[PDB]
Design a protein around this nucleic acid. Structure first.
Lengths: 146, 49, 48, 195
DNA sequence: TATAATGGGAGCTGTCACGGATG
DNA sequence: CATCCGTGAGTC
């Protein structure tokens, strides 16, 4: 079924970058896999922890005193992982923006400028997301991207 | 069927012989690869376009 | 054409400061490159 | 973020491409974010650890090979065992041929899946071994693997600013004389492009 | 601004004669 | 010596 030829011919195509600037961006997004409903919940959990460990140290830096070497580092890793989870959620639902940015085409503003401004809303959407409500990420996102 | 319909000529016999690859899958993949480089070739995405 | 560059230039600034993933930030930079190029010489590279 | 003047890039012959001895088609894939480019590499640090790095990479290839040879064995065991279990049931010998060819198909995939891993690990080691400025790493998953493994040993960037750096570390006087030596050599085609 | 929603879309068509980079 | 891209092709 799966020939060696196709397996080679698949990596040959995917590796080559098309000339179209719109197409090239579409190619990039398709790499990341769409998120499961509960997979979204995990990232949401992570970001909260990450976004929270950040709010701690922020005000502590102004007042002065800092955590010990074992606490701060442990605290710091959540901050990285939290900021990493945020990027993972933005990359997964990155298709979502492109889905409803194609409709506003031909209104005096370029497609790419629309997708970007849409992505820009998606970024704010991922910050104020709450996983306590049993709603998928896709719904609270849409209202923010439009 | 290629030999049947276009066999009355030597220029088509000379073409099917100099043909690089054979196979229905391999032909679609080949055309796909030359039409739109940059996109993953499924046996279903080359049949479609 | 000026308006296109400044618009995308100031979007790059927001994206950089928001700590946006490289996939979005790079995309902006590319558009900016094409934006500035379109201003200097339109149609030279790609469609006008 | 920096951005290249389109006049000195697309204008033929490509002035930037002539300057950094970079291919016109390779210059595209860099400036417009389609392929990463090596900006600098700590060649000394690579050498001082080259031996140690070789051994580490070597263990991985083995650890991959060892699972392959073990996984293949377990399947060969179950192929032979199942072919005898469908023999104790008394099935038609032809119905055993389907099962026989099935296993031989499975083992082939196992051997191939591991082979792609080895070839990936091979192309990784090769690329890092022969890493130098002005190289284009167009495959992204390689570059990522290349960074996570040996990120300490080279400076890799992408886009217009990466080209900006190349121009900064550019030795005009040196590249000038080096081209003059190629001019002193009789060989025409390479003297043409050097002229 | 909390149901859920996740990879675009028009191509453009009838030159001509030439130099330079590539074959 | 023959292909591929870019730049020419009268004035009011």
């Amino acid at each position: 079924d799966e020939s060696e030829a196709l397996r080679q011919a698949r990596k040959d195509a995917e590796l080559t970058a098309s000339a179209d600037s719109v197409r090239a961006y579409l190619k990039q997004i398709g790499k990341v896999a769409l998120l499961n409903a509960e997979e979204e919940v995990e990232l949401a959990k992570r970001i909260e922890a990450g976004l929270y460990a950040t709010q701690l140290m922020t005000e502590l830096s102004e007042r002065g005193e800092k955590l010990p070497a074992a606490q701060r580092r442990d605290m710091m890793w959540i901050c990285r992982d939290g900021d990493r989870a945020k990027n993972h959620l933005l990359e997964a639902n990155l298709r979502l923006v492109v889905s409803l940015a194609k409709r506003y085409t031909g209104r005096g503003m370029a497609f790419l400028d629309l997708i970007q401004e849409g992505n820009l809303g998606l970024i704010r959407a991922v910050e104020k997301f709450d996983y306590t409500k049993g709603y998928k990420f896709s719904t609270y996102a849409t209202w923010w991207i439009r | 069927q290629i030999v049947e319909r276009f066999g009355f000529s030597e220029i088509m016999r000379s073409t099917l012989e100099k043909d690089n690859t054979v196979g229905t899958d391999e032909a679609l993949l080949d055309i796909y690869r030359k039409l739109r480089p940059g996109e993953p070739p499924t046996k279903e995405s080359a049949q479609t376009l | 054409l000026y308006r296109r560059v400044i618009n995308r230039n100031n979007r790059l600034k927001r994206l950089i400061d928001l700590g946006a993933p490289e996939i979005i930030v790079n995309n902006e930079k590319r558009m900016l490159q094409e934006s500035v190029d379109a201003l200097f010489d339109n149609g030279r590279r790609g469609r006008p | 973020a920096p951005v290249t003047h389109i006049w000195y890039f697309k204008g033929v012959p490509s002035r930037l491409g002539y300057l950094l001895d970079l291919a016109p088609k390779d210059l595209e894939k860099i400036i417009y974010f389609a392929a990463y480019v090596i900006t600098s590499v700590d060649e000394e640090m690579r050498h001082n650890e080259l031996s140690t790095l070789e051994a580490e990479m070597a263990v991985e290839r083995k650890a991959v090979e060892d699972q392959r040879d073990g996984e293949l064995e377990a399947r060969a065991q179950k192929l032979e065992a199942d072919l005898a279990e469908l023999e104790a049931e008394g099935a038609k010998a032809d119905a055993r041929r389907k099962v026989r060819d099935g296993g031989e198909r499975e083992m082939r995939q196992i051997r191939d899946r591991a082979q792609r891993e080895l070839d990936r690990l091979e192309d990784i080691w090769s690329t890092f071994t022969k890493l130098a400025p002005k190289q284009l790493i167009v495959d992204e998953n390689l570059y990522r693997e290349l960074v996570d493994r040996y990120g300490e040993y080279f400076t890799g960037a992408m886009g217009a600013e990466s080209i900006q750096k190349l121009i900064e570390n550019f030795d005009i006087d040196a590249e000038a004389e080096s081209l003059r030596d190629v001019i002193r050599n009789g060989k025409g085609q390479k003297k043409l492009r050097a002229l």
